[PDB]
Write a protein that binds this DNA or RNA. Structure first.
Lengths: 106, 332, 187
RNA sequence: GCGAAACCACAGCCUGGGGAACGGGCCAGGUCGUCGCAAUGGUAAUUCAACUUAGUACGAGAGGAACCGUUGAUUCAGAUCAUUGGUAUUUGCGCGGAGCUAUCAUCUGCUGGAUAACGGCUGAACGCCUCUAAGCCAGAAUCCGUGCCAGAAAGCGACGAGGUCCGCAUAUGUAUAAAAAUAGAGGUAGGCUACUCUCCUGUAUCGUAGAAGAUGGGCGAUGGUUGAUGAAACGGAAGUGUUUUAUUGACUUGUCCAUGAAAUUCCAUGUGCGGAAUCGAAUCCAUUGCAUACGACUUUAAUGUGGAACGGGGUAUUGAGAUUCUUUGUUCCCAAGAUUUG
RNA sequence: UUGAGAAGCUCAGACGAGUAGGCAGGCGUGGAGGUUUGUGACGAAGCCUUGGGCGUGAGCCUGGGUCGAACAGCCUCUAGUGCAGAUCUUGGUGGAAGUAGC
RNA sequence: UCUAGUGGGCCAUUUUUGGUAAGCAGAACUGGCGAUGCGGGAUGAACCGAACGUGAGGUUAAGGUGCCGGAAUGUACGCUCAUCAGACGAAAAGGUGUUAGUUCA
């Protein structure tokens, strides 16, 4: 089944936050394989999605997606800042996100 | 309540004395049983000389508050395999004997009359139908075990006790190899062993049992220590209460049976002192955890004369038989 | 770098605090972590140092002695255990003494940021958690220190069988001409 | 059965700190059974005292070791209740059975290491020396475990004993198993080696084509993957999986060809509940004091050597008389009904 | 170019804590004069509502339900004109509590 | 020209007088809090930043980047192993406890 997955695995770590104030509009995403802020420049502007399933079979489907884009790197270790169309729920801390390769400049 | 060793005080659920610590064993030790279940027949005082170096009563006769414990020969009817695990001691598999008495099978059934009395009935079926399964279970025990214990049920039927459910205690075979322990139990499956085989009566037996319910007053399991046996009298022996000095035959049962227990018919063990728990209570006679070498254990027992004055009620004679000619001919 | 669903870590030679902080961050990152050989963890400081630390802890609570329970306590203090997120992250950690059968046949990784040989200065006294636990109440040290040889002997036999099996393909590799005909790609 | 009133900002587990109480309110923390293992606590016997061991070696001698049992005892803990004292509606005959309480009859309270001080061995620093600095041993009434008491009403293992009808609602490659140390290891011919090799991370290895992976012609090899069953071995620490396969079918990317892909004409992606007819089990229940404010607990009533009550008798009580565990006697009871889940 | 409610329209720049206190502009209620050739049994007012909308806000508009006879916008006049507190007044109803008890 | 409100204190700093076992007390001065929310300081009425319309984006201050906790388990050079480390008077000394250096040598 290794003829698929055009995307890259990622994890939703947290929102942008200070010690005591959280900003849910921007989320901190750890793209796996990206290990520094210079490698995070490749994934800037790429589409990222959160894919989950819900009980109702609305649209005749069991899966729904929240889309987003990668805006800028966060820190030195390769984490990025992502803004989603809808703010990611706080329950999705440590959940998985998919980073496509489009819009591609390669 | 000053000793917090027994505080907090809560009543022990199991009437049977539980062996919280079995004696340590080694391959050099021969394969043997460490515990034997007994019943509190009585504890009248009987005279016995004390041959003890330095004793104020060295070579002098002493009346001793001894204790007779009814001990019907225990039947080993199964085995349990114990695997040593980093989280404790786990039961690998339990291999019962093929056939079980109704009494031990009754232990499992709260009522025993319910519908079908099916205790191990299919187990008895698969046991005979597939003996190889039991062989594999035995093989698994010998291959993957360190502590082998044997299932044992009480022959209450020999005792004069209303209870029918046979008390089952997991006595541990000690000594030799694990395979040797399994082999001894397998060859002894569905077979009974007298306490005379388990204990030699010169051995110091730390009998343990549950204290009686005072009415949390009482009802707590306790472990007596430093209790050397004085005479493991067998039930068939009618000379058990007749020592060499009082050669005249007399059964261990005194006149008027036993207090709230009735007569003794099976093997018994004589031991000085008192033990927790009321009359005719299941008492765990077990090997001593420590091989204490006190002079009391070193000195042998040479019992002078067994008291057989009346149990429940009052008796002024050792046995009615001698009292028959002692008193004048009755009106009858 | 990359995550797996379950990560098994061989805690032999790993410092308690360094490994716990890495594990706690991985637990909050959404990963299931299994730490085996928790009795082989190391703590910087002499035997008497952490002895008095644990003895003072005994003076204070449910005092746990097992090495995994020591490691589980260290990881828990680095988690937001007062919230549902911290509790959920805690339940993804499985710390055990030794390597149980479900894990001795699985690959075990190590954390270089927590290894003693790469973090402690040579010649510094250290206290193993398993040895430290043995005198403070833990009583299963001898039996687990005896069973490890049985696991090692079985595992060593497996490696020899695997190495012997691999030799056939390794010889067959250079035997096939196509291995070197198109080896210009670096393979 | 009848039936208040005061009171009421609001919730309400503790240790520290929050400077003005901070606290309560902030911050940082704490199906039914069987037979067993033990996470975690608590702990007990304190002992001496007096005669030998003793007027013992040693000590001019006195003093007095080592020493060895016994006899008891100071205080406190769990207790049996046999026997005895008391007993005390046997209301049987002051006695007082059956049993209870009471050492007032009796039991009755563990033991191996690591250590403190101190004393040593080894031995530098400080050629020696130096209990110490690397270390080790001896050694406290200390500590730790052992033993005992419990067990975690939501700690576990082995073990014996719910199923059928009716209605209704309907993750993306989940790929990777010696151990071991850096004052380094692994393996190495040969016959215990010798010496070489390797590392110097997995950026590796295993797999990876197919209109989500088609249809065929095949060819090379006549074989790699697997599905399905039939399987045997190994795996105990929590084996729950590692193989060995016997075949039966396929894809076989090993390779070479012929067809089909599109107007998606630029991204959007059996299972659960509610009912019944059933089979067991458990509780209530015949029950019982074993337990007892009540709850709740323990035993016994399912067609039988059944259990139970009497007719009794024994045991003793009593001091010629009477009574009450036992009974091949009689009868009652009886496949003893409901409830509860499975 | 129509963008003269000149009380309108338009362009630009700067600034924005706030107790006492000061000054503007507004919202709502009862009644009065005028007005909307106003609304109403084909349903006024009130009330209810996880319906919708408007305003920074006070507030206002509206759908549905309930209901059954009156009521509102605008300009002006007027005042017994807006409440969470007063150990506030009156009325209703709670926890205590089926407790203390008879 | 007239016209509302106030006619205190606290934190204290600094300069400063007397002191007195020693702390401490007394003047002036200085500003702040008092009418002031916000980032930090583990938490904090007075400490470090900064003073406020509703928002988007960027960048910082004071503090920080092992985990809790957003951010280098960063780089380079040193001290220490504390069995009551350190991170925040019993204090004199003792250190067969040391690290570097200076002097005489």
């Amino acid at each position: 089944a290794q003829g698929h997955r055009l995307y890259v695995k990622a994890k939703h770590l947290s929102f942008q936050r200070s010690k005591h104030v959280i900003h849910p509009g921007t989320s901190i995403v750890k793209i796996e394989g990206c290990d520094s802020k210079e490698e995070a420049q490749f994934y800037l502007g790429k589409r990222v999605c959160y894919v989950y399933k819900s009980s109702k079979a609305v649209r005749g489907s069991k899966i729904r997606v929240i889309w987003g884009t990668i805006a800028r790197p966060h820190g030195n270790s390769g984490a990025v800042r992502a803004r989603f169309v809808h703010n990611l729920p706080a329950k999705t801390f440590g959940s998985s996100l998919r980073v496509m390769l489009y819009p591609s400049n390669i | 309540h000053g000793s917090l060793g027994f505080l907090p005080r809560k009543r022990a659920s199991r009437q049977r004395g539980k062996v919280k610590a079995f004696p340590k064993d080694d391959a050099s030790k021969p394969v043997h049983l460490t515990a034997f279940l007994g019943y509190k027949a009585g504890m009248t005082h009987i005279v016995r000389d004390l041959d003890r170096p330095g004793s104020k009563m060295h070579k002098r006769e002493i009346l001793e508050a001894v204790t007779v414990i009814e001990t019907p020969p225990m039947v080993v009817v199964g085995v349990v395999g114990y695997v040593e695990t980093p989280r404790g001691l786990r039961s690998l598999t339990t291999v019962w004997a093929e056939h079980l008495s109704e009494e031990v099978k009754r232990r499992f059934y709260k009522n025993w009359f319910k519908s079908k009395k099916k205790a191990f009935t299919k187990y008895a079926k698969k046991y005979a139908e597939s003996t190889q399964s039991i062989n594999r279970e035995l093989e698994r025990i010998k291959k993957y075990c360190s502590v082998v214990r044997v299932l044992a049920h009480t022959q209450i039927r020999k005792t004069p006790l209303a209870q029918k459910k046979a008390h089952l205690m997991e006595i541990q075979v000690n000594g030799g190899s694990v395979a040797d322990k399994v082999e001894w139990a397998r060859e002894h499956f569905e077979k009974t062993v007298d306490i005379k085989s388990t204990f030699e009566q010169n051995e110091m037996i730390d009998v343990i049992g549950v204290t009686r319910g005072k009415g949390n007053a009482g009802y707590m399991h306790r472990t007596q220590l430093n209790s050397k046996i004085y005479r493991i009298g067998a039930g068939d022996d009618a000379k058990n209460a007749s020592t060499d000095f009082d050669a005249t035959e007399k059964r261990i049962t005194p006149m008027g049976g036993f207090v709230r227990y009735g007569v003794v018919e099976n093997d018994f063990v004589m031991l000085n002192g008192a033990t927790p728990g009321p009359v005719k209570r299941v008492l765990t006679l077990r090997k001593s955890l420590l091989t204490h070498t006190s002079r009391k254990a070193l000195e042998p027992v040479s019992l002078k004369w067994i008291d057989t004055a009346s149990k429940f009620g009052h008796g002024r004679f050792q046995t009615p038989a001698e009292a028959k000619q002692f008193l004048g001919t009755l009106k009858k | 770098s990359e995550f797996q669903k379950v990560v098994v870590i061989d805690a032999k030679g790993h410092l308690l605090g360094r490994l716990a902080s890495v594990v706690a961050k991985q637990l909050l990152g959404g990963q299931k972590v299994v730490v085996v050989r928790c009795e082989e963890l190391n703590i910087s400081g002499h035997f008497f140092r952490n002895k008095l630390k644990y003895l003072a802890y005994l003076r204070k609570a449910f005092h746990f002695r097992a090495p995994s329970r020591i490691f589980q306590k260290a990881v828990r203090g680095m988690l937001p255990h007062k919230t549902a997120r911290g509790q959920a992250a805690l339940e993804h950690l499985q710390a055990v003494e030794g390597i149980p059968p479900p894990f001795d046949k699985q690959k075990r990784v190590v954390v270089p940021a927590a290894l003693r040989v790469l973090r402690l200065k040579p010649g510094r006294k250290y206290c193993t958690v398993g040895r430290l636990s043995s005198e403070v109440g833990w009583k299963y040290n001898d039996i687990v220190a005896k069973l490890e040889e049985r696991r090692k002997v079985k595992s060593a036999a497996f490696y020899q069988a695997k190495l012997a099996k691999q030799k056939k393909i390794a010889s067959a590799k250079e035997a096939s001409p196509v291995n070197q005909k198109l080896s210009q790609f670096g393979y």
